[PDB]
Design a protein around this ligand. Sequence first.
Ligand SMILES: [Zn+2]
Lengths: 108, 120, 83, 50, 58, 131, 159, 141, 50, 242
Amino acid sequence: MSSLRHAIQRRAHKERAQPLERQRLGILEKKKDYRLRARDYKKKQAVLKSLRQKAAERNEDEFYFGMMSRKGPGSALTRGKGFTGTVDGDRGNKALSVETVRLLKTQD
Amino acid sequence: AAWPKAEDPALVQELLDCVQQASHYRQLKKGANETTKSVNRGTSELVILAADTQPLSIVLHIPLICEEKNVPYVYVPSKVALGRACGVSRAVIAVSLTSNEASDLNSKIRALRDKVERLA
Amino acid sequence: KPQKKETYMQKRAVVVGREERKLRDLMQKLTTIRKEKIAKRKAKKEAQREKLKKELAEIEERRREKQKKEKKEFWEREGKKRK
Amino acid sequence: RMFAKPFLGQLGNGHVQGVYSMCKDKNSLNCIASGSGDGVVKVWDLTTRD
Amino acid sequence: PNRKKEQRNPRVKKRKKYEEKQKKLRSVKAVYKGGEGPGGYQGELSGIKTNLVKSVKL
Amino acid sequence: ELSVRVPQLPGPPDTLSDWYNIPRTNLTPELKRDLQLLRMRDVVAMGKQFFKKDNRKDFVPEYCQVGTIIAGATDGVSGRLTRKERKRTIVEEVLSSDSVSKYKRKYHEIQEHKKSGRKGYYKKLMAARKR
Amino acid sequence: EAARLDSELKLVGEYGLRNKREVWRVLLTLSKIRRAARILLTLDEKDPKRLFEGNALIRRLVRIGVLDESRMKLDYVLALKAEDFLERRLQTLVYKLGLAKSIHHARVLIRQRHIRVGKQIVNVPSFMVRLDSQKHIDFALTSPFGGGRPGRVRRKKAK
Amino acid sequence: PSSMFFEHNEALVPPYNVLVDTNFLSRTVGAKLPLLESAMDCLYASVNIIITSCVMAELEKLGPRYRVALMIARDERWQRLTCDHKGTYADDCIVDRVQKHRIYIVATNDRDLKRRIRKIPGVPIMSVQKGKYAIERLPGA
Amino acid sequence: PKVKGRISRYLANKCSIASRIDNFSEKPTRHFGEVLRQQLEQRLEWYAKG
Amino acid sequence: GAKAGKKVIVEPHRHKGVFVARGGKEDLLCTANLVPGESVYGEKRISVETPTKTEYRIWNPFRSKLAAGILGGLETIYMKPGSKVLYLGAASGTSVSHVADIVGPTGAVYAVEFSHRSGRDLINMATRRTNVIPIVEDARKPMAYRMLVPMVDVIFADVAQPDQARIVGINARLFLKQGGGLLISIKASCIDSTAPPEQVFASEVQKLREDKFFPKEQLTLEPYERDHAMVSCVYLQKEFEG
Ligand SMILES: [Zn+2]
């Protein structure tokens, strides 16, 4: 049980460190750090597998009405060197009319 | 002017005996300013006021705060007897004896303030 | 995309004073200490919640064991009555 | 038949044994009395039935 | 096993158990603990919450 | 005697009729700083004084009014802020008070604990490998 | 049961007792006194047994200072309690008379022989102090709070 | 509530207020056992012993076979707590009363009401155990 | 110093006595204030001997 | 502490007419001042210059059992602005000023004091506030002020008497509307000094129920006063107004 064990039965076992001749390579990854690494990789691969399923089973004739108010991801040919697959969003700025810029420049 | 005046038949001496008991128990504040500060801090359980005071307006000003805080007050007829009962070697005209959560004096306090509430 | 040119609404911005910058820095420091304190309190409460759920699961295991024992005692008494 | 609800109340705690005699006051309007089986009588006032 | 300096004396253990169970009581109910101080009324010193009803609904 | 009337025909309430007309909050940036300070007043007195945990989603109430304690006539020697301490906002009083170094110390401990292993650590590991 | 554990812990904390054996000891003598009071209430009023035995019981409790001198009925003798008995103990009387700073300080003083009850020093903290003997609790003459030698750590320091 | 130190009710000091249920009352008349005398002999203290109108209602709703227990309940020297609710259900009446005020000793004998009032901290349960009464969760007795 | 605060406390005591005497009378008097002013004057003479 | 000159903000409470002024390290309770620019008994008050005449006055819970009950957390206090309040036990008019500041100019507070010098202080503060009328009479005999008190909505009862339930029963039989709110402040050491306070409170609640009230809330206002309770009850109904 738990009362049938001495304090030397309860005593913790220490963890060894990376050798000092090899400490420049980083920390010695043990089971806990390996579990963190494996959890992050399995999570990222699960998201990527779901994205690959969604890109495979895509209707080529789909029509949402946000397509008339968004700029598409395009291709590398149409966009150019600045091509990421992400749809570009708006930063909030807008082209500003001349009367309001006349007001702002009088204030400045 | 002192309408809750204590009468003779073994109520003044019960009051002064409880006063001496509380003064031994260190649960008692002496003098007009200390009675006033104890009533305004609300720790007071009962307050004894002398009635033989040269001009009585001092032990007339204390009952207003006692009636505002609703604590019992009672006049004993001798400030010399009140000082002798406290153990002061001076004449005391106002005595307020406080409350504590654990004592055996509080039974005397409770019976005394029942008699005083019947006196009022 | 992080904008690289400086717009006119960024060029015309007023340089803020010293007292308002001291108030801004104080508000930054207070909001960070508040966020760290809230995260610590939530971690402690989640630890207490998981300990409570462990002990609740142990109590439910004991309840299922006593329920099975009382069920078998009752049906052992009734199976002799229908025999 | 829906609003036929005839029970209104009960005078006090009642008696200990059963009520074997009772009599109203024919001059007043709220004076009742009732004498029980253990020989105790009670005078009730109908305005305060508590 | 190794036991505590508190556990070697049965009075001091029951002193520290009462000090911490009187401390756990203030976190549930409200103790009186003296009225207004000598300084007066410095406000309700730890918050006032408006949408909290703490009365025993009879 | 009897005159031609003036014809005066051309949402949420402005003033509360039941609370003696508290005006609606003019949500200035100073009042917003004051309300953030009031929801973080547990952090301000750093553990010396804990507060009732009132945590709604919006800390700004609908009706407020920024006032000033005038005077208790019984206490006026130490229960009275001096001229060099009567400040404009509440955040200015918190900053003029002490333990701003205590806030900075706790902030730098939090900053070390949050920069503990994120990316400068990995840049240092990569440099020590490449050397 | 949790009610018994919390009640006995309140007694052991509020009066600086050592264990629950002292609580059970007081509860046993209180139950004996209260059983005698119930047996005397069984009889009718103005029976000579109830009259003289109840007067003996009430005079005994008033003389040992538990029952108050105001209330002297056998119903209040039934309404007696263990908080009143532990209040009549000596250790809480030293704490309430203020010779000691806390109840554990009072137990420490009574153990190492500083206070005296009347004439003789008292080594036991559960000494049931009577009402007549309540006033004569003070520091003994051989104690450094009473007089005589300045004491032990004082002697080692003044050498 | 005030006077509650961690499931220890400090509000109950003698004279003990004891609520009586119909099961306890029928069984204490059935066991040839005097009610106030046996309660005082159980607690060694002066009881005042109360019966709600739901309890009197259930004793009256039981037939004329229980007329003796009805007269025993209708003894005059006991307090009658009038109830202001609808159903005349003694269990919920007793539990609501005890949950509000919590100064009472509940005297029952049914295990359903006993398990229902064991959940709330600091109420003793008095039950007749064929020779005398027995008080369950009172620490002073 | 100390004598200034001592005279301040004594003056506060006698001013409290004078305030309650002048207040709680119906139509007040003069001679009790005269007595207390003589007492303050003889104390002003008393502190000079030292 | 809550020093003079600190900036606080003043938000409404859950109750009507009461506000809570919070700021910095101390949140306190206040009511809108009826006569602005003057304190009654030397209390701290709160001036806000609206974008002058607006002032709030701080409500001491250690001095007034109503503010102690509000900070304890009563479900309602029955006194909205414009509701008549009969105050019994209006000793010197300290909390009566805050009740009058709650009920505002269109309400009325009938403050009954028995002693005469407390009556002088009450007549002074009711000279200041024109909606509190002072009645120097014994609250045990409500036939004296039946010309003065019309049928009020709320009764406050802060009398420390052993016959407190009978006093409130006859005063509410004479001057309280059908379904009338009241708050009674029970002090156990003055009701029954020997008995435990929870038993004293249950006995006083039972006496009110015999005197035809229906009790709906009860709190022991413990961090402000020892062995005190505040019982809220409705006269002759179960709901408050109708
Ligand atoms: Zn019922």
